Design a binder for this molecule. Structure first.
Ligand SMILES: Cc1cc(C)c(Nc2ccn(C3COC3)n2)c(C)c1
Ligand SMILES: [Zn+2]
Length: 140
């Protein structure tokens, strides 16, 4: 589990979104595994605006933050899980790292701020949903 709290937005994995998220919906994209909902309180996270390929992510199944190198956001064939059939997931970045389903939502961050959230993995591979192209997270 986990979210990004930026401005009056809450950024979650679409497959973990609650009823309250869907009732306060701003934007959702199944192909990216992303959903954004509105919040009453302002959040403290800042979004990175960059092409970093190094950063640190939170792994809940180890209670540890790991430094990683990660690929640029891409269209990547992701094998079927409990939440999605085998499909191309878009805006996905891959790194070598431990992940399990409940790690979803862990933040990846670089020197500039938040880069994305854990979305998928297995076999020592972790995939992150990028948010750095979502420039509207920084306004209104
Ligand atoms: C963060 C994270 C998210 C998901 C959904 C998984 N499990 C998945 C993904 C693809 N598979 C196929 C079915 O057996 C291989 N299982 C994992 C391990 C980590
Ligand atoms: Zn950066």
């Amino acid at each position: 589990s986990g979210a990004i709290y930026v401005g009056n937005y809450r950024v979650v994995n679409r497959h973990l979104a609650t009823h309250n998220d869907w009732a306060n919906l701003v934007w959702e994209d199944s192909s990216r595994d992303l959903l954004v909902s509105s919040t009453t309180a302002q959040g403290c996270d800042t979004i990175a605006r960059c092409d970093c390929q190094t950063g640190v992510y939170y792994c809940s199944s180890r209670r540890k933050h790991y430094p990683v190198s990660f690929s640029k956001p891409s269209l990547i064939f992701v094998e079927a899980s409990e939440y999605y059939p085998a499909r191309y997931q878009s805006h996905l970045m891959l790194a070598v790292g431990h992940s399990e389903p409940g790690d979803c939502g862990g933040i990846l961050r670089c020197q500039h701020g938040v880069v994305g959230i854990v979305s998928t993995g297995g076999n020592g591979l972790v995939g992150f949903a990028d948010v750095r192209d979502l420039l509207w997270l920084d306004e209104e």
